[PDB]
A paper describes a structure:
FLT3 is a transmembrane receptor that is expressed on the surface of early hematopoietic progenitor cells and dendritic cells. Mature wild-type FL belongs to the structural family of short-chain four-helical bundle cytokines and consequently exhibits a noncovalently linked homodimeric structure, in which the two protomers interact head to head. Due to their highly similar build and the dimeric nature of their cognate cytokine ligands, RTK-IIIs are thought to be activated by similar mechanisms. The binding of a dimeric cytokine to an RTK-III induces receptor dimerization that results in transactivation of the auto-inhibited tyrosine kinase domains and the activation of downstream signaling pathways. However, structural studies have shown that the hematopoietic receptor FLT3, a class III RTK, does not appear to engage in such receptor–receptor contacts, despite its efficient dimerization by dimeric FLT3 ligand (FL).
As part of efforts to better understand the intricacies of FLT3 activation, we sought to engineer a monomeric FL. It was found that a Leu27Asp substitution at the dimer interface of the cytokine led to a stable monomeric cytokine (FLL27D) without abrogation of receptor binding. By mutating Leu27 to an aspartate, we hypothesized that the entropic penalty for burying a charged residue in the hydrophobic interior of the second protomer would be detrimental for any dimerization event to occur. We concluded that these experimentally determined values are in excellent agreement with their theoretical molecular weights and confirmed that FLL27D is indeed a monomeric species in solution. With only an excess of FLL27D detected, this shift indicates that despite its monomeric nature, FLL27D was still able to recruit all available receptor molecules into complex formation. The molecular species has a molecular mass of 70 kDa as determined by SEC-MALLS, which is well below that of an FL-mediated receptor complex (152 kDa) and therefore allowed us to infer that the apparent FLL27D–FLT3 complex consists of one molecule of FLL27D and one molecule of FLT3. Given the observation that FLL27D still binds FLT3, it comes as no surprise that the absence of structural deviation from FLWT remains valid for residues 6–13, which are all key players in the largest interaction site of the FL–FLT3 epitope. Importantly, although the triclinic unit cell contains two copies of FLL27D with apparent twofold rotational symmetry, the observed apparent symmetry axis is dramatically distinct in direction and context from the twofold-symmetry axis in dimeric FLWT. Likewise, no combination of symmetry relations can reconstitute the head-to-head dimer resembling FLWT, despite the fact that the loop containing Asp27 is located near tightly packed crystal lattice contacts.
Numbering used by the authors:
A (entry chain B): -3 to 134
B (entry chain A): 4 to 134
Write the structure that this text describes.
């Protein structure tokens, strides 16, 4: 269920063993290299920073479902399912300090896979309420 | 980087407004956060960046938007005729919506329109950041 009023923590792992294969499959079969963004000045925390990058990536995945054709929906949703859990927490709006770089979906997917590798052993073990506010580097 | 005939038509603002108002689907875009505050070179720098977004949006917008997008592209495509250089590493960006990008674009064209056929703009080919 949702975690919108309570602590941002997970009793069952939302990240499956085969996230890397799912992400590599979408990246290999994409029909075009859609223009997206990544944050450029997030505070360099491994765990919170992974969640922050997944919050942003998850929004891109939903956006792409609205512009990619039929044939991409299953591949896109497979990646969405590995990262959709962040929507269950009350992440707050990004701060005005946040900066971005425009890049391509392939780079975003690579970054996403890297965050899941970092988060997977931790995801069900921690209270991540401390991460709901995105932070920038000075 | 100079123009013998004005590449900006009288009705740019109506064309941009039409795209903004009837945009069928929003898609995040970027604008620069720390460009040097030059009115004329700065307008050109913002249009170089906006014109690349117009081309990107054609690759994600549906059939019905292509005419609206191209009508704006034609108003700002003249920047592709100059040898603008790759942005410097200092340049940073914010994520925003197409409406904001379009309002910024219209504002640059109002500033540039009286100057565009008179001036040599070679001094603008390198984008500059604020201190």
């Amino acid at each position: 269920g949702s975690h919108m009023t309570q602590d941002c923590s997970f009793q069952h792992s939302p990240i499956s063993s085969d996230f890397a294969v799912k992400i590599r499959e979408l990246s290999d079969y994409l029909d075009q290299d859609y223009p997206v963004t990544v944050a450029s000045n997030l505070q360099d925390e491994e765990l919170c920073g992974g969640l922050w990058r997944l919050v942003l990536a998850q929004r891109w995945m939903e956006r792409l479902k609205t512009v990619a054709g039929s044939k991409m929906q299953g591949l896109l949703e497979r990646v969405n399912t590995e990262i959709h859990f962040v929507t269950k927490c009350a992440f707050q709006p990004p701060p005005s300090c946040l900066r971005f770089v425009q890049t391509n979906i392939s780079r975003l997917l690579q970054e996403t896979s890297e965050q899941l590798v970092a988060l997977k052993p931790w995801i069900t073990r921690q209270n991540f309420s401390r991460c709901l506010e995105l932070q920038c580097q000075p």
